[PDB]
Each structure stands twice: as C-alpha cells, then as structure tokens.
C-alpha cells in the first residue's frame, strides 16, 4: 500500500506507471525507503 507512485501532477495521466518505469517487483514485505533531510540557518555576523 505504501509503494504507490508519488509525483506532482504536471500531467495527471501517466502513459507508464512510475513503478513500471522503476521496474520493481515490490511485495508487501519489501521495506520501502523514505528519508527527508532539511537544514535551515539564519546567519548574524558575530563581527558586531
């Protein structure tokens, strides 16, 4: 259920499934991988 395609719809209709383009044979027991990494920083000169 968690292996469904994820995309932003510029074109809503998919001529080929993203999984099909990925060529996987995903099963229920296959651990799908997701990792989000975000960094944010605001810089103030210590030279006052």
């Amino acid at each position: 259920l968690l292996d469904s395609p994820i995309k932003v719809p510029l074109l809503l209709s998919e001529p080929i499934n993203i999984i099909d383009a990925l060529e996987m044979r995903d099963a229920v027991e296959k651990p799908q991988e997701f990792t989000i990494v975000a960094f944010v920083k605001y810089d103030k000169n210590q030279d006052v």
């Binding site: 292996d3 998919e14 080929i16 499934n17 999984i19 099909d20 996987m24 044979r25 995903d26 099963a27 229920v28």
Partner: protein, 48 residues
C-alpha cells in the same frame, strides 16, 4: 439501437483495455485478477 450500442461498447472496451493495462503494470497484493474479472463481467452485462 444495435449500432449505437456497438459504438458505446467499443468505447467501453477501449477504456477497459486501458484500465487493465494500468492495473497489470502496478504492484498489487491479490486484486489484479479480481479487477479483471469485474471488468469482464461488466462487458457481459453491457452486451446483455
């Protein structure tokens, strides 16, 4: 009536083929066959 129903059935068959093509090219647990059978029964219902 026969001609109109034939045209509508042709359109429905095109849609069914497209949907089946999408279903086959997607990961699934056990429901591919169920959907295909539902579509076939729908075609028979259309003919009736």
């Amino acid at each position: 009536l026969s001609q109109v129903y034939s045209k509508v059935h042709n359109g429905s068959e095109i849609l069914f083929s497209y949907f089946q093509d999408l279903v086959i090219t997607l990961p699934f647990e056990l429901r591919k066959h169920k959907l295909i059978d539902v579509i076939s029964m729908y075609r028979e219902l259309l003919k009736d």
